[PDB]
Amino acid sequence: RPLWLPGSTPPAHLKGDLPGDFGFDPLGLGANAESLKWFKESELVHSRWAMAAVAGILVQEIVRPDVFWYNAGKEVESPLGPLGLLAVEFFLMHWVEVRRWQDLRKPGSVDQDPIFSQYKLPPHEVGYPGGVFAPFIPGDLAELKVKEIKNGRLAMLAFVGFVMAAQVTGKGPIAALQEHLADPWGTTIFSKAAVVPGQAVAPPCKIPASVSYKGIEIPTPCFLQGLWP
């Protein structure tokens, strides 16, 4: 079995049934199956969120450059009332999330379109609605799920590294890429900072301070500033 370590031994509760495992849980927290399903769900959740996020940020930096995706929160504009937008947002989200959670806590219990009785989703797996939720399927879930989880974990890493690269350079990830390409040698946190018993150094942040939006003036500190190297 392909393992996250060549030549090592998987733990107890890890075998390989669920895709995306290769015997990795050094803390062995996958003991309780309840929390384990909980965490499978949560990891799928985060992976999908982050995949969507990186995709959107990338394509947007592409087509509409010079718009700091990080500062889109600030510099967005729309004639619609922001309060109404966030209201619709909250309510929509409360609904969808309570649906998914009610189904998790009680499997196969909400599978119907409660409006159109004709419409009702077939039986499926928690974390795998499908049917209408997956109408067209080329290939096999055997590979689809493994690719899903792989790409999702990778995209989580992508998103967080984008955030770091912004906090350190303020540049969009593509800008930072072109920068790295320009100087392969000097474009490294290595070439940016280091720590020694004599003295320590860290790169300064580009996210300036409390952002002054339309009256609120959001306090904008840094992520764990003092321990960046």
Tell me the binding residues for all-trans-violaxanthin.
25, 27, 60, 69
Q: Which of 134, 173, 133 is nearest to 155 (CA)?
A: 173
Applying CB under 8 A, among 15, 29, 212, 229 the residue interacting with another protein is 29
Residue 118 CB, nearest approach to ligand CLA (Å) = 31
Q: What does 140-174 look like in DSSP terms, one character per residue?
A: -HHHHHHHHHHHHHHHHHHHHHHHHHHHHH---HH
Q: Which does 142 bind (CB under 5 to 8 A by kind): another protein, ligand CLA, none?
A: none
Q: Judge contact between 157 and 53, C-beta under 8 A.
A: no
- The Cα 45–Cα 36 span in angstroms is 14
Which stretch, 4-12, 60-68, 126-134, 170-178, contacts another protein (CB under 8 A)? 4-12
Binding-site size, another protein (CB under 8 A): 25
Cβ distance to ligand CLA smaller for residue 8 or 76: 76
Cβ distance to ligand CLA smaller for residue 76 or 132: 76
- The Cα 229–Cα 225 span in angstroms is 9
Structure tokens that stand for 209 in this block: 């301070």
Q: Judge contact between 192 and 203, C-beta under 8 A.
A: yes
CB atoms within 10 A of CB 180: 14
Applying CB under 6 A, among 44, 149, 155, 165 the residue interacting with ligand CLA is 165
Q: Which does 83 bind (CB under 5 to 8 A by kind): ligand CLA, another protein, none?
A: none
Within 44-103, the residues that bind ligand CLA by CB under 6 A are 52-53, 55-56, 59-60, 64, 67, 72-73, 75-76
